[model samples]
Target: LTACPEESPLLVGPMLIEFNIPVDLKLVEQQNPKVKLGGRYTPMDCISPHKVAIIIPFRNRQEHLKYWLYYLHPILQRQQLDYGIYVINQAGESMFNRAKLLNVGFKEALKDYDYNCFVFSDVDLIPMNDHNTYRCFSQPRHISVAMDKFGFSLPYVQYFGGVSALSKQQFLSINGFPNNYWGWGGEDDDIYNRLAFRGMSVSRPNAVIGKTRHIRHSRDKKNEPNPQRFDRIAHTKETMLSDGLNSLTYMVLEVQRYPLYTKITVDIGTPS
Candidate 1:
């Protein structure tokens, strides 16, 4: 419950593999007191500059989440942001529509607090560096710039996957993400297209500071690659305006607070 300095002096660097690994949730929760029951956090200091809500689209990745909560909570608190961690869990075992869950996160997170920034992050990917501030910048930001998966290099130019951040204004300006991108694939590109169409360029931290580590896991049964992804991406300009957060609809099944983060279970409905 101590007030952190306005400018954080935390140094960002790559994580030691042995040191940065997951532990039991019971052990992890004991580190932070601000960790509300359903995966939420609010700084004890009230006058922080940004009101951020970290929206993680999740399914059955509890082990990865345990690691994420272990590392991220302290890093976020070090960043000195007035933030809340919201793990938007999809209800039932339908195909995982990451974009839609993120949309739900934006809509639902705001229901509890007026968060100005929303960080759409993957549960498995944890930043290796703590100084990769988990808040928004002047425009859209790509936080996980150098992931260990692709030899710590960006695979392509439109590599907007992994972790990213957007201000509420910036997110709404592009209408959030497309709801139709079910399963994995085009949603990240569609978001990039949405931002590009609006003349907004993506920003990133230095590669050294933006390093991230992804937990290894086999792909989910329902999360197979989307064959129609290329076509959907091609039509992003055509559907950008109509198919997004504005067109989003869902049922909130439950909202629970935990010692580490807020879990927002939602019924996004069956995919068409």
Candidate 2:
């Protein structure tokens, strides 16, 4: 194992498996032009002095978080990002409201820092290849294009897992993520639908570089997707205004940010 730079200790946040019997990590330079190391060429700072916030809506997944941190910290450093890690913990055990938590994260993340780009990531997923690059590009980015679960590929046409990065302007233009999605499933579909409605194409790397690993876990209680997701997904442009954040009502319970990411705790009203 090679030592990391003191100013940047090769921040490998989390790693689930012990590959290479320790995955002999060494700092390599300029693996990909899309990526930069040590505050060099971040897209956020390219246009302005802005940072990127990785917003992860999570709860009771310390093991997953550890693995994510171990693997991504180093990747982010290599990308030379001014980024932060936010684990948006559900304040209570009521129900795992993924969409609401993410909405809260978006709001709370901007409270202190001015991050132009936000990456919505799932904590259990880890990118095995660093060439994927963690920053956003000309268009919206789906960083984790090839995950191991779906045969190291996108499970379906609408699948947007792994990691996604969106500019604050882009997110706002889409009016932010839907807050009414009370469960899993539809939230991502709704977000993707929003992206389409806004005429924003998704940017991605080839499957060879965008591969990732997902930590398994049982579905949380009362967190199932609305059965009508299929029906609603087709009409995002028509009904989104009435069914999304525009119809949202929430109260912030807590908010915090670290050098790596921003987190928020919230209490959303009962589902409609």
Candidate 3:
């Protein structure tokens, strides 16, 4: 335990950002020999302070997932974090409920391990630098602060969209994210409000260390951004006590432990 480097010896500041068509899952698995089932890992040389659960909210982005598994295992390993990768997949024809799926990921992941930190992320987001750690901090963190999507600069201060991390206690204090922000836009804003209401700020790495690459893909317009977005943001402090973790509902349809990640398909019901 004493031998664990203060910094992981395996870390290299930069990463080769590329889109490898049809990435081979087997190669990713072979590359990270230390990662065990359900995508869990701990540094063999030392004890890590953060037992993190990487909770990815997903849908029909199989190709993107392949890349996440491919790039992230190595990063987490070098971060010296005791972490598990959980891909919380949404099931069926209803509108995609990202926050609810995240709640489900938290509820379900805790059933399997003692994870004190959770990284709620989207499938298509990949960090551009390995030094941009995935663990939690004193405050909630917006790790994907700089992304190629916005030319590597934050679009707005409240843009806590792509990937964020919250410690278990911090998450509970904020009621574990608003479980009802059904579609895209409103959900992230609601989370920032949750953090704001608790007097907890959002931390982030330096722009150079915090960049992420969004896999370019055709946008799906089936779900227009939530119709009642800021209107709800206005009332976050009011509904939060009743609508988030305490009131979340979902069914785990499948929990498949793949070689590189644990994928749990959940039926989050219709968005009525």
Which candidate should be chosen as best, given TM-score against the real structure?
3
lDDT score at residue 214, model 1, on the 0-100 scale = 81
lDDT of each residue in 88-154, candidate 2, tens digit only:
7777666566777776777777775677888888888888766666667778888888877778768
> What lDDT score belongs to each candidate, Candidate 1 first?
0.85, 0.67, 0.88
* Candidate 3: tens digits of C-alpha lDDT, residues 1-272: 65466667777997877786669999998999999987989888888889899999888888999988888888888889999999998888677788888999999999999999999998889898888989999999999999999999999988899999999999999888777777667888888988998898989999999989999987555456888877988899899999989988888998999878898999988766
Residue 229 of model 2, lDDT score: 65
Better of 1 and 2 by lDDT: 1
* Candidate 1 lDDT, 22-93, residue by residue in tens: 487887777776667665666665456688999999998888888888888877877778888889999999
RMSD of 1: 2.2
Model 2 residue 199 CA deviation (Å) reads: 1.1
- Tell me the TM-score of model 3: 0.96
Q: What clash count goes with each model? A: 13, 16, 0
